[PDB]
Design an enzyme around this catalytic site. Sequence first.
Site, PDB file in Angstrom:
ATOM      1  N   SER A 195     -19.068  16.836 -10.926  1.00 23.75           N
ATOM      2  CA  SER A 195     -17.882  17.243 -10.264  1.00 23.75           C
ATOM      3  C   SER A 195     -17.821  18.720  -9.882  1.00 23.75           C
ATOM      4  CB  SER A 195     -16.682  16.897 -11.146  1.00 23.75           C
ATOM      5  OG  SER A 195     -16.295  15.526 -10.975  1.00 23.75           O
ATOM      6  N   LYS A 252      -7.009  11.961 -20.026  1.00 22.92           N
ATOM      7  CA  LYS A 252      -6.379  12.474 -18.792  1.00 22.92           C
ATOM      8  C   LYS A 252      -6.230  11.345 -17.745  1.00 22.92           C
ATOM      9  CE  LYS A 252      -6.482  16.449 -17.241  1.00 22.92           C
ATOM     10  NZ  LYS A 252      -6.304  17.843 -16.590  1.00 22.92           N
ATOM     11  N   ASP A 253      -7.272  10.513 -17.586  1.00 17.11           N
ATOM     12  CA  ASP A 253      -7.223   9.383 -16.648  1.00 17.11           C
ATOM     13  C   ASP A 253      -6.228   8.303 -17.062  1.00 17.11           C
ATOM     14  OD1 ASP A 253      -9.008  10.614 -15.010  1.00 17.11           O
ATOM     15  OD2 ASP A 253     -10.535   9.032 -15.062  1.00 17.11           O
ATOM     16  N   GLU A 262       2.966   1.239  10.028  1.00 15.31           N
ATOM     17  CA  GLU A 262       3.290   1.195   8.611  1.00 15.31           C
ATOM     18  C   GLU A 262       3.745   2.448   7.931  1.00 15.31           C
ATOM     19  OE1 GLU A 262       3.761   0.149   5.360  1.00 15.31           O
ATOM     20  OE2 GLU A 262       4.673  -1.460   6.521  1.00 15.31           O
TER      21      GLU A 262
HETATM   22  C1  HEM Z   1     -12.648   3.631  -2.105  1.00 12.32           C
HETATM   23  C2  HEM Z   1     -12.285   5.090  -1.778  1.00 12.32           C
HETATM   24  C3  HEM Z   1     -12.718   6.131  -2.817  1.00 12.32           C
HETATM   25  C4  HEM Z   1     -13.010   5.969  -4.100  1.00 12.32           C
HETATM   26  C5  HEM Z   1     -12.986   4.647  -4.861  1.00 12.32           C
HETATM   27  C6  HEM Z   1     -13.367   7.147  -4.632  1.00 12.32           C
HETATM   28  C7  HEM Z   1     -13.736   7.305  -6.066  1.00 12.32           C
HETATM   29  C8  HEM Z   1     -14.078   8.726  -6.478  1.00 12.32           C
HETATM   30  C9  HEM Z   1     -14.230   9.071  -7.931  1.00 12.32           C
HETATM   31  C10 HEM Z   1     -14.102   8.158  -9.125  1.00 12.32           C
HETATM   32  C11 HEM Z   1     -14.513  10.501  -7.979  1.00 12.32           C
HETATM   33  C12 HEM Z   1     -14.770  11.222  -9.275  1.00 12.32           C
HETATM   34  C13 HEM Z   1     -13.869  12.415  -9.619  1.00 12.32           C
HETATM   35  C14 HEM Z   1     -12.580  12.588  -8.861  1.00 12.32           C
HETATM   36  O1  HEM Z   1     -11.608  11.941  -9.195  1.00 12.32           O
HETATM   37  O2  HEM Z   1     -12.484  13.396  -7.957  1.00 12.32           O
HETATM   38  C15 HEM Z   1     -14.584  10.968  -6.561  1.00 12.32           C
HETATM   39  C16 HEM Z   1     -14.926  12.375  -6.217  1.00 12.32           C
HETATM   40  C17 HEM Z   1     -15.171  12.657  -4.747  1.00 12.32           C
HETATM   41  N1  HEM Z   1     -15.004  11.739  -3.643  1.00 12.32           N
HETATM   42 FE1  HEM Z   1     -14.190   9.937  -3.649  1.00 12.32          FE
HETATM   43  N2  HEM Z   1     -13.237   8.172  -3.672  1.00 12.32           N
HETATM   44  C18 HEM Z   1     -12.877   7.389  -2.509  1.00 12.32           C
HETATM   45  C19 HEM Z   1     -12.579   7.863  -1.133  1.00 12.32           C
HETATM   46  C20 HEM Z   1     -13.231   9.169  -0.808  1.00 12.32           C
HETATM   47  C21 HEM Z   1     -13.098   9.728   0.396  1.00 12.32           C
HETATM   48  C22 HEM Z   1     -12.244   9.126   1.516  1.00 12.32           C
HETATM   49  C23 HEM Z   1     -13.802  10.853   0.420  1.00 12.32           C
HETATM   50  C24 HEM Z   1     -13.920  11.866   1.549  1.00 12.32           C
HETATM   51  C25 HEM Z   1     -13.841  11.298   2.952  1.00 12.32           C
HETATM   52  C26 HEM Z   1     -14.383  11.028  -0.779  1.00 12.32           C
HETATM   53  C27 HEM Z   1     -15.325  12.166  -1.081  1.00 12.32           C
HETATM   54  C28 HEM Z   1     -15.337  12.529  -2.520  1.00 12.32           C
HETATM   55  C29 HEM Z   1     -15.755  13.713  -2.910  1.00 12.32           C
HETATM   56  C30 HEM Z   1     -16.256  14.780  -1.958  1.00 12.32           C
HETATM   57  C31 HEM Z   1     -15.658  13.835  -4.239  1.00 12.32           C
HETATM   58  C32 HEM Z   1     -16.096  15.151  -4.940  1.00 12.32           C
HETATM   59  C33 HEM Z   1     -15.427  15.485  -6.271  1.00 12.32           C
HETATM   60  C34 HEM Z   1     -14.912  16.899  -6.276  1.00 12.32           C
HETATM   61  O3  HEM Z   1     -15.396  17.717  -5.554  1.00 12.32           O
HETATM   62  O4  HEM Z   1     -14.004  17.249  -7.003  1.00 12.32           O
HETATM   63  N3  HEM Z   1     -14.122   9.932  -1.629  1.00 12.32           N
HETATM   64  N4  HEM Z   1     -14.294   9.884  -5.773  1.00 12.32           N
HETATM   65  C1  LIG Z   2      -0.622  -1.651   8.656  1.00 11.87           C
HETATM   66  C2  LIG Z   2      -1.048  -1.393  10.031  1.00 11.87           C
HETATM   67  C3  LIG Z   2      -2.253  -0.463  10.135  1.00 11.87           C
HETATM   68  C4  LIG Z   2      -3.197  -0.573   9.121  1.00 11.87           C
HETATM   69  C5  LIG Z   2      -4.348   0.190   9.108  1.00 11.87           C
HETATM   70  C6  LIG Z   2      -4.569   1.084  10.126  1.00 11.87           C
HETATM   71  O1  LIG Z   2      -5.725   1.838  10.090  1.00 11.87           O
HETATM   72  C7  LIG Z   2      -5.702   3.208  10.313  1.00 11.87           C
HETATM   73  C8  LIG Z   2      -4.900   4.040   9.541  1.00 11.87           C
HETATM   74  C9  LIG Z   2      -4.893   5.427   9.784  1.00 11.87           C
HETATM   75  C10 LIG Z   2      -5.688   5.966  10.788  1.00 11.87           C
HETATM   76  C11 LIG Z   2      -6.496   5.120  11.562  1.00 11.87           C
HETATM   77  C12 LIG Z   2      -6.501   3.745  11.325  1.00 11.87           C
HETATM   78  C13 LIG Z   2      -3.614   1.213  11.166  1.00 11.87           C
HETATM   79  C14 LIG Z   2      -2.460   0.438  11.172  1.00 11.87           C
HETATM   80  O2  LIG Z   2      -1.373  -2.682  10.658  1.00 11.87           O
HETATM   81  C15 LIG Z   2      -0.529  -2.952  11.649  1.00 11.87           C
HETATM   82  O3  LIG Z   2      -0.506  -3.987  12.251  1.00 11.87           O
HETATM   83  N1  LIG Z   2       0.328  -1.887  11.801  1.00 11.87           N
HETATM   84  N2  LIG Z   2       1.361  -1.849  12.743  1.00 11.87           N
HETATM   85  C16 LIG Z   2       1.280  -1.191  13.987  1.00 11.87           C
HETATM   86  C17 LIG Z   2       2.455  -0.907  14.675  1.00 11.87           C
HETATM   87  C18 LIG Z   2       2.391  -0.279  15.910  1.00 11.87           C
HETATM   88  C19 LIG Z   2       1.158   0.060  16.455  1.00 11.87           C
HETATM   89  C20 LIG Z   2      -0.009  -0.229  15.769  1.00 11.87           C
HETATM   90  C21 LIG Z   2       0.061  -0.858  14.533  1.00 11.87           C
HETATM   91  C22 LIG Z   2       0.107  -0.899  10.858  1.00 11.87           C
HETATM   92  O4  LIG Z   2       0.758   0.096  10.696  1.00 11.87           O
END
Ligand code: HEM
Ligand SMILES: C[C@@]1(c2ccc(Oc3ccccc3)cc2)OC(=O)N(Nc2ccccc2)C1=O
Lengths: 377, 79, 49, 240, 60
Positions: A203, A225-226, A269
Site C-alpha cells: 500500500s 480497522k476493516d 440514477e
Molecule cells: C471492484 C472494484 C475495486 C475493488 C474490489 C478494489 C479493491 C481494492 C483493495 C482491497 C485495495 C487495498 C487497500 C485499500 O483499501 O486501498 C485497493 C487499493 C487500490 N486500488 Fe482498488 N478496488 C476497486 C476499484 C478500483 C479502482 C476503480 C481503481 C482506480 C481506477 C483502483 C486502483 C487502486 C489503487 C491505485 C489502489 C492503491 C492503494 C493505495 O494507493 O492506497 N481500484 N483496491
Molecule cells: C442505473 C443507470 C445507469 C447505470 C450505469 C451507468 O454507467 C455509467 C455510470 C457512470 C458513468 C458512465 C457510465 C449509467 C446509468 O441505468 C439506467 O438505465 N439509468 N437511467 C438513465 C436515465 C436517463 C438516461 C440514461 C440512463 C441509470 O441511471
Amino acid sequence: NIRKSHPLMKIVNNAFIDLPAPSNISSWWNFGSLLGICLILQILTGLFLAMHYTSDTTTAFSSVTHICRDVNYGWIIRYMHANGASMFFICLYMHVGRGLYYGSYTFLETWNIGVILLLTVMATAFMGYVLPWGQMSFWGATVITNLLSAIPYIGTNLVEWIWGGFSVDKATLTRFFAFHFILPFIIMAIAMVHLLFLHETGSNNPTGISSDVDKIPFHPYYTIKDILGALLLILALMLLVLFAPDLLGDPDNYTPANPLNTPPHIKPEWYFLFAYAILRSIPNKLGGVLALAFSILILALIPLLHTSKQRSMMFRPLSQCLFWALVADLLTLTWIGGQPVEHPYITIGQLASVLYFLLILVLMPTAGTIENKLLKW
Amino acid sequence: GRQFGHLTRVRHVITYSLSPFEQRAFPHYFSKGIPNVLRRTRACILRVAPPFVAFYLVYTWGTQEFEKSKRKNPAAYEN
Amino acid sequence: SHTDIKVPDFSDYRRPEVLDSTKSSKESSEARKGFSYLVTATTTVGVAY
Amino acid sequence: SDLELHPPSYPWSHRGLLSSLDHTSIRRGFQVYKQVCSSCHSMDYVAYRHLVGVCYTEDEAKALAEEVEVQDGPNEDGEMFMRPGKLSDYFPKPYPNPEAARAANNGALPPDLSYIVRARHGGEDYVFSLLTGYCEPPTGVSLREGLYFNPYFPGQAIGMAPPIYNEVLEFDDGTPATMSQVAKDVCTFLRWAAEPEHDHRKRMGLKMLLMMGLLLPLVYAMKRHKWSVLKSRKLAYRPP
Amino acid sequence: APTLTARLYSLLFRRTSTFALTIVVGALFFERAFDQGADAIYEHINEGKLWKHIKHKYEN
Ligand code: HEM
Ligand SMILES: C[C@@]1(c2ccc(Oc3ccccc3)cc2)OC(=O)N(Nc2ccccc2)C1=O
Ligand code: HEM
Ligand code: HEM
C-alpha cells in the site's frame, strides 16, 4: 500451526495476516475492503433475488413485486441489493478520489486494473437497473444503448445487434439478465488480479513517502480497522433500506412498460449524473458520446500527467485547491445532470464540462510544475 | 509480495511500547481530541471549503434564474 | 551507556489500577482483562444477534 | 401547459422515522376503494388475504371476498363459469383489455392501483391534494370539452371527475364520511397497498439503530485497545 | 473482596471454552430480552396496530 506452509492459507496469510502495511494508512484506505464487501453483498442478495425473479417481458415487473409482497423478506433483500448498488458507487468514487489525491495511480498496473473494474461495475449496474422493466429502466436502457449508434459506419448494426431486434425489447431484457449475473463473477476475478498487482508493492500512504521503515502487520490492526469500517458501511446501507428505501429510486420505475411513451423528464440514477451532464452539454451526437467516454476513460491518462516531484498532495497546497475544485466541479455536474436541458442550466453545464477537462488535462499538471519551482526542485 | 525481515535497512532506533491491557483505549478523548480536530480543520479549510461555496453560490443563483426566467415570468405582453 | 536508556513515562496513557509503582499489577490483572474481554464478548454477542 | 404547483405538508401519523399506520384508517380507506375507486381503477397486486393481516379478520376477509364474481378455471366441457369469491386473489378488474377503460372514460386511462411511491413525487400528499383540491377553472383558459380541471396534476387540466363527498359511507365506528376524512383514509390505505412492509421495516429499523448504537461504540473500543500499542509507542534515535 | 470483572474473568473468560460458552448462552438471552424490550418500545410509541384494532371482533 502453520499458516505459512499450507499452499492455501499461505495465500490468506500473505494477503490478510502478515502482509506488511503502512502504520499510517487512513480511513480513506478502508474503501478497497468495502468495495469487496459491496461485491459480496451484491452477490448474495443478487442471488436470492434470482431465485424468484423472472426474465420475460410480461412477468418481469410483476415478479419483482411478487418478491416485495409475497416472498418472505424479499423486500429487505431487494432493497439491500438496490441500496448496495449505490453504496458500491459511493465506494468506487471515494476509492478513485483517494488514489488521485494521494498519487496512488503511480502503481500503473493496479490502477489500470481499477479502471477496468470501474467500467465493469458500471456495465453491471446498467444491465441491473433495466431488469424490473419499469419506465426509467426501459428509457434509461434506450438512452444508454443508443450511444453505440453514434459510432461511425458500424454504429447501427451494433445497437441492433446488442438489442437482438429493432429496439429494446424481449431479447434485450433476457440477455441483460444473463450478462448481469455473470459480470460480478468476472469482476471478482479482476479484483483478485487487482490485489495481486497491489501486493507486489504494498500500500501507499497519506505522505506519499515509502513506509518500509515503519510497516505493521495487517493483522490485528487492519483487521479490526476493516471490521469497524464494515459496520459503518452497514449502518449507512441499512439507514437507506430501513428508513429511505425510495430515496434514490425514481418513482417512474413503479410503472410498467411504455415503449410508446417516454416520461417528461427522464433522470439517471445518481452516479451517472455527472457523466450525463457532460454527454448532454455538447449539442452533437458523436461528440457527446465521445465526451462521455473521455469523461471516464480519462483516469487512464492521469498517470501521464503527473508532474510533481512529490507523490501525494499532502504537502501541496496548490494541487489541493485544484483537487477540491475538481470535486466541487463534479458535484456541479451532478446537480446539472439531474436538471432540465434549459436556460441557466445548459450554460452552467457547458462551463463545468470544460472545467473538468481543463483542470485534469492542464490545471493540475501546471500546479504540479509550479509547486516544484516554488520548492527549488 | 514482501515480508517482514526483507523490507529495508534501519539502524539506531529504539521503540518503547505498552501492552494494551496496561493502557487506556481513550485517554484524553475530548481533552486532547477536540483541540486536535479544530487544528486539522483550520489547516485544511482554505483548500477544501472555497470550491464548495463557489458551487453553493452557483447552485442557488442557477435555480433562481431558472424559476424566475421560465415559470414565474410571463412578464408583460401589454395591449 | 546502554544503561543511559530508561523507558519514558507512560503515566498519561496508563489505566488507573496501575500508575503506582510500589503496587504490584497482578492485583488488577484480572479486572483489566475482565473489562476488555467483556467488551469483545458483548460485541460478538451483539453480532451474534 | 408546463406550469404547476406541489403538495402541502403531510401530517399523517406515518411520516416520522418509526411510525406505524393507523390500521383503523387503512380499513376505512379500503372501503373507499371498495365502493368508489374500484369501478374505475384496477388494483392488480393486492389480495383478500393481504388484508387478513392488516385491516380485517380471517372470517371477515373471506366474507368481503365473497361479495364478487371472478372467472374460475375450466371444467370437463372446457368451460369458464363464475365463483363466490375466494380469499386468494383480489382482482376485481373493472375492464378487460385496457383500451376498454379508455373507451368508457373517454381518452383518459384510469392509471395504476396500489398507489403513491408509484410515479407520483410527494406520493400520498400529491394524491390527497389531487382528490381534495378540485377548483374553479380561472379566466383566460377553456377546456377542450368539459374534461375536468385540477390545480395540481401535470398541466393543471385533464381527465377524472371529482369523486369525493358523494358521502358514501359504511364506516362502522361512528365516523363522519366527510370529504377530507374519506381522503385521509384512502391515501392512508393506498400507502399500505404500495408498501405493505412499511411497519415491519421501521420496527426492524428501530432495532438497527438500537443494535448499531451498542455495537458501534463497542467495536470502536476493540480497535482502540489493539491500536493502543501504536498510539502511545515512543521513539528515540541514538546514532553513534 | 475481589471485583466483579475479576470474578467474571476467573470463572468464565480465561478459557476460550467458557468464554465461548458464555457468549452463546449470552446471545440466547440477549436476543429474547432485546426482542421483547424492543417490541414494547415500538408498540408504546405507536398504538394504531392490528392488535388494539382486533379487540373489537371476537365474533366472526
Ligand atoms: C471492484 C472494484 C475495486 C475493488 C474490489 C478494489 C479493491 C481494492 C483493495 C482491497 C485495495 C487495498 C487497500 C485499500 O483499501 O486501498 C485497493 C487499493 C487500490 N486500488 Fe482498488 N478496488 C476497486 C476499484 C478500483 C479502482 C476503480 C481503481 C482506480 C481506477 C483502483 C486502483 C487502486 C489503487 C491505485 C489502489 C492503491 C492503494 C493505495 O494507493 O492506497 N481500484 N483496491
Ligand atoms: C442505473 C443507470 C445507469 C447505470 C450505469 C451507468 O454507467 C455509467 C455510470 C457512470 C458513468 C458512465 C457510465 C449509467 C446509468 O441505468 C439506467 O438505465 N439509468 N437511467 C438513465 C436515465 C436517463 C438516461 C440514461 C440512463 C441509470 O441511471
Ligand atoms: C377514489 C377515491 C379514487 C381515487 C383515490 C383515484 C385516484 C386517482 C389518481 C391518484 C390518479 C392519478 C393522477 C395522475 O396520474 O397524475 C387518477 C387518475 C384518473 N382517474 Fe381516478 N381515482 C378514484 C376514482 C376514480 C373514478 C371513480 C373514476 C371514473 C369516473 C376515475 C377516473 C380517472 C381517470 C380517467 C384518471 C386519468 C387522469 C388522466 O391522466 O387523464 N377515478 N385517479
Ligand atoms: C451475483 C451477481 C448478480 C446477480 C445474480 C444479480 C441479480 C439481480 C436480479 C435478479 C435483479 C432484478 C430484481 C430486482 O430488480 O430487484 C437485479 C437488479 C439490480 N442489481 Fe443485481 N445482480 C448481481 C450483481 C449486481 C451488481 C454487481 C450490481 C452493481 C452493484 C448490481 C446492482 C443491481 C441493480 C442496480 C439492479 C436494479 C435494482 C432495482 O432497482 O430493482 N447487481 N439484480
